[PDB]
Subunit: 151 residues, 3 copies
């Protein structure tokens, strides 16, 4: 029973992996640690969420956005390791959101990422996390997600 | 008798707080190999978030220093829960801190020294760390700061 | 041999003197085979050359120049730690912070100043993943801060 089967059972198709925005690699590996560059909420090559939590998007939409960015991040991890069953653990999630001052519910939005990790990787998806808000995002994305995996 | 981090906390008159619950569906710490890393730690005292606002607007630099010190005390409580005896930590090799800072203030590195100085006070040479610092406009719980620690076991 | 040092020479780049910490922390630390710097600034001859905000005070090409200079500072730090830059197996990660005005989202182009220098100087050993942030307030009002992670 693989992460891939769970994606199928959840009705989730892994997107095509997006190109870097600059002269960097989409992931790197040091020893047993695999880490992604920033992953966006793309669907069918379109950046679906462009704006700010609390102003343009509700918390439930932010949740959806972090879920989709994480699906993109998982696509990136699959590209890197072939079979997602090779991943011993997704030990760390780090996420950035653009958030209006009137809203401090961004940890709920980032649960979109956390929840998918647990859904797809099970106990292997239990992770620590970091959260940031930034005023300006690449592509005006609502969010950016980074994953760290142990092989 | 023994020069443990715990004895230094006692000597400093510092009691470790109870470890706060996660704000979402994540672990308070994770371990990969010999690397133990916390999730975000807040300046809680007796279950109350003591600093809520922005450096330079709501809090002075010395208050930010105190806030980062308290968040780091919380982070040390988290580490103690994870490893039992803080003597088991070979080094706190990295501190990463976030503050909410008003444009009129660039003395946030001095605030984050509240964290760095406590790591050195409590862990001695094992507390020597590199560090990252960020400012963010919006914080969870409107906290003035958030601290993350990374330790080698 | 073609080495990072020889490539710096070829690019006409001199490594700056390594700046002091802004607080009670180490300029780098090491866990296992992983070396990680603290924040590195765009210093030239001991002067912080870029103080302000991308899109407001500095253009994208100036941001690129700033990130390049901060990265040259970071490489100076790496050379101090490792002695010979050939001993670095890889610069596996770059993490950069910029202060950026709402009117500008071309900060990834500015951070390419850092990414491009790593590739120019370290070649294949300079291929890295990266993280980018924007923060409203920076230490020393620097335009940018760069952090490097190297495998030893
Ligand atoms: Ca990191
Ligand atoms: Na909307
Ligand atoms: Na006040
Ligand atoms: Na200018």
């Amino acid at each position: 029973n693989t992460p891939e089967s769970r994606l199928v059972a959840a009705g989730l198709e892994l997107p095509e992996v997006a190109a870097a925005l600059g002269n960097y690699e989409p992931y790197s590996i040091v020893g047993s640690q695999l880490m992604t560059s920033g992953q966006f909420p793309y669907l069918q090559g379109k950046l679906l969420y462009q704006g700010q939590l609390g102003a343009d998007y509700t918390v439930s939409e932010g949740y959806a956005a972090c879920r989709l960015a994480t699906l993109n991040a998982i696509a990136q991890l699959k590209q890197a390791c072939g079979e997602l069953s090779r991943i011993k653990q997704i030990y760390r999630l780090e996420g950035v959101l653009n958030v209006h001052q009137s809203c401090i519910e961004h940890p709920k939005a980032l649960d979109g990422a956390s929840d998918l990790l647990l859904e797809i990787f099970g106990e292997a998806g239990r992770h620590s996390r970091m959260i940031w808000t930034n005023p300006v995002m690449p592509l005006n994305s609502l969010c950016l997600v980074y994953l760290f995996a142990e092989l």
